[PDB]
Amino acid sequence: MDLIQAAYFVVAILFIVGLKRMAHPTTAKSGIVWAGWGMVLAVLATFFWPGMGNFALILLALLLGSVVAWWAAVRVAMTDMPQMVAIYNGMGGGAAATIAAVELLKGAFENTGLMALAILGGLIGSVAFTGSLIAFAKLQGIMKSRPILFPGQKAVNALVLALTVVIGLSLLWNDATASIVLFFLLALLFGVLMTLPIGGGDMPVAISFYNAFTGMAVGFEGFAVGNPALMVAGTLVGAAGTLLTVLMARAMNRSVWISVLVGG
Amino acid sequence: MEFGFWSALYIFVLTCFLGYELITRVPVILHTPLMSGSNFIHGVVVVGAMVVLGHAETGLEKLIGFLGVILGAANAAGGYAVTVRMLEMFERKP
Ligand SMILES: [Hg+2]
């Protein structure tokens, strides 16, 4: 499968050039177009993976998700774009988790540092998923915009975090499919818990953060399974995303620690 | 970090620096589009959800794989769509 390899390498170049161009006034518009092909190529080429099956379920799933998202993106008001970026970034996190989760149910690795990596991805992505949905909720006024506070939450969040990581690790020695679900629920829960304290007006920064989050999540998921397309792109974005988060914070004349709480 | 460990590790870090480097010097006016398009880019997750769906046996595997791929494709489709819409704010009306 040097062919799939060839295609994923070109895909990698297409993303890099594309990301590079999105970053400059005169090249910005074409950037997304380049990245565009990168995806086409990537998706096409991945039909040729050895031992591939369940095609109908694949097409159906591709069609549904791409169509419903495109439809939504094309219809919303411009002033609702921050939340849209949020929901679509959520779903990426989810994606990374769904990957993580299925390889786990298949106990598909005898290499344990790889198991580790998948799990780490699964945590981060789950979190970016629910954290992005809450962000969404606030911008949409489905949920209170203001920081949502409670008696001693700082600890609950830490505690939930630690529990999750711990049951996360636990999978290396023992991964009763029971403990798997627990891990995701804790991850998911923590995403929610994390974002409650974030003020509506701070949200574009948190959205960047979660973008970085899902980026990293997919890169990790990529290394863990042997996928270069994901390896490169995840981290590329994870990296560029985290820097972007910093400059956004700076532009708002705010710190990201400031945003990540504003009251415990 | 795999295929094989050392090579992969260089790949992580080389990309980490590059990810970073490309984004320094972005003007402020380009923050959110950049954010949108990098959001699009990480949509490649589908490709891994794809592989997962297409190698699923037990059927609990079916469903979640299926989700994975729906989620994946939304990420891409939406991301692309959104970024294009953002970019048009920069164009004069003819
Ligand atoms: Hg870096």
Side-chain angles (χ1 to χ4, degrees), chain B residues 4 15 46 56 58 63:
Chain B
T15 300
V46 256
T58 85
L63 212 209

Side-chain angles (χ1 to χ4, degrees), chain A residues 235 239-240 242, chain B residues 12-21:
Chain A
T235 113
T242 115
Chain B
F12 173 67
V13 165
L14 287 160
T15 300
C16 190
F17 278 107
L18 185 45
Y20 202 95
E21 197 52 39

